[PDB]
Write a protein that binds this ligand. Structure first.
Ligand SMILES: C[C@H]1COc2ccc(Cl)cc2[C@@H]1C(=O)Nc1cncc2ccccc12
Lengths: 296, 300
């Protein structure tokens, strides 16, 4: 029993964190094979990069300085070719995630991991992370079997305290750019499929007070979802929630009628899984993983 | 900016997780140097869980009865001893991945990271607090016994908890790494219950200071309180008494924000009386008590 916000074990990623220094700027790099990936703002990025030589980039892996033998830019990520392949490189892939998907973030400062937390890519493409100066280059990841899927690299903090970054190919999530200019996160919405998954996790943990005899149509639910700034629930989401629906005996549209009642009436002083708010940072897969015990 | 429940990076602990099998029971072990630490109930059978005589069960065991697996490598047990509720299996290989470590026993209110494991394989990492009733509100399924709680301050891993059992309310009880249980619990299947839980007051105050540091001031008020008047109100909401030690501990956060500790105590009293009124503090509609004053300073 128990339901916690749980991150993947960060060990495979800790062995990849390096410190990248260029001039006065120091941030984090991800050392995979013989390449160090980091935000290109560490340095007109084409004009700024052409002026830099390999020895201008100081890369530090622990107390060992790596020598940069090449540099190239891919979108908003700088790729520093180093002489040494990382012996700790795990099986990995670069994956771009969709809003609503969750991942673990290994927050780093000076190439040293300080914390790990689990979060979701908001529908407005920001992450509600926890980052201070020097955290740039910190990465988001998931693990499947022994394979690390890198999905995020931290680049900046928006004026509202939320965070923006890119995939490992340097493409930003959201309508953001990597420079000092007026940028704002769009109005956020609740990840509906994730709330439903969390309501199933609550039922699995013995919290049933919110269940009701009612069921709704997908179209009637989406009219309610639009009114409460909840993301539309698609037939794909309903299908994805299928296993949880089978395990608990609560059909997705039966759970939607519970969600609709919770949105129109509130919690009435009650909590679900120790929360007075509807949690939306657990995907249906996270719920199955945690309420079954999948290891890495 | 931002405030998240943050766990320590688990890599230093992942390299220590092993699987310990004794008969039909399989759980997790912590391999440090040439010793594997695990819950002593790994030696228990079906009719042993109610009233086990661990000394009597252990004397009947031989080294080759304990199968220890580190990855796809079987470790050879060359000795065994019991220290309180932890079994210590001497193995023939020192763990090359042993980090700098220490065993620390924590007090209620203290936080730590848990590396949840099944079959010696880490599956997740989360942040916890030792409740005032000595239980932890973890996320554990069968096979998670032997999973450990830790803090990583300055490259040294401080092991503070080892999971042993789940109480009937879904909460968890365990020991320090010297095998001493936290709380009045015993490693027996006899009727045991967690005492009524209370809110860790010093942690809520630290979290209210984190909220002020992150720019949220809506809950602040023009009042102050005496420490005694705060405790008389707070105990009525099942909040732990706030001691002068706690007030002293909150001193640095009081200095950074400019809000006297007893002034923050008056905001807490008002929040307890009024609730949040549809508002949130650091993305929460409840008062968070699993961030210590040390965690708040570390993260902010
Ligand atoms: C044999 C069980 C029950 O009785 C005792 C009694 C005493 C001891 Cl020290 C261990 C156990 C074992 C136990 O609590 N294990 C577990 C620990 N964590 C999460 C669990 C989730 C679900 C099922 C069991 C869990």
């Amino acid at each position: 029993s128990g339901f916690r916000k749980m991150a993947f074990p960060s060990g495979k990623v800790e062995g990849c964190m390096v410190q990248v220094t260029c001039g006065t700027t120091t941030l984090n790099g991800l050392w995979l094979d013989d390449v160090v990936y980091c935000p290109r703002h560490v340095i007109n990025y084409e004009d700024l990069l052409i002026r830099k030589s390999n020895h201008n980039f100081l890369v530090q892996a622990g107390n060992v300085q790596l020598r940069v033998i090449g540099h190239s830019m891919q979108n908003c990520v700088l790729k520093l070719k180093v002489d040494t392949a990382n012996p700790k490189t795990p099986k990995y892939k670069f994956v771009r995630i969709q809003p609503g998907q969750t991942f673990s973030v290994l927050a780093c400062y000076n190439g040293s991991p300080s914390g790990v937390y689990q979060c979701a890519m908001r529908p407005n493409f920001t992450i509600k992370g926890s980052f201070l100066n020097g955290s740039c280059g910190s990465v988001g990841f998931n693990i499947d079997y022994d394979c690390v899927s890198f999905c995020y690299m931290h680049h900046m903090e928006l004026p509202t305290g939320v965070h923006a970054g890119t995939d490992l190919e340097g493409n930003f999530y959201g309508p953001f750019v990597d420079r000092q200019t007026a940028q704002a996160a769009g109005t956020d919405t609740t990840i509906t499929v994730n709330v439903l998954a969390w309501l199933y996790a609550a039922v699995i943990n013995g919290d049933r007070w919110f269940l009701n005899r009612f069921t709704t149509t997908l179209n009637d639910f989406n009219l309610v979802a639009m009114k409460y700034n909840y993301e539309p629930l698609t037939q794909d989401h309903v299908d994805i929630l299928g296993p949880l629906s089978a395990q608990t005996g609560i059909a997705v549209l039966d759970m939607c009628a519970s969600l609709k009642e919770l949105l129109q009436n509130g919690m009435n002083g009650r909590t679900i899984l120790g929360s007075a708010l509807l949690e939306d940072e657990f995907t249906p897969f996270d719920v199955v993983r945690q309420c079954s015990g999948v290891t890495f």
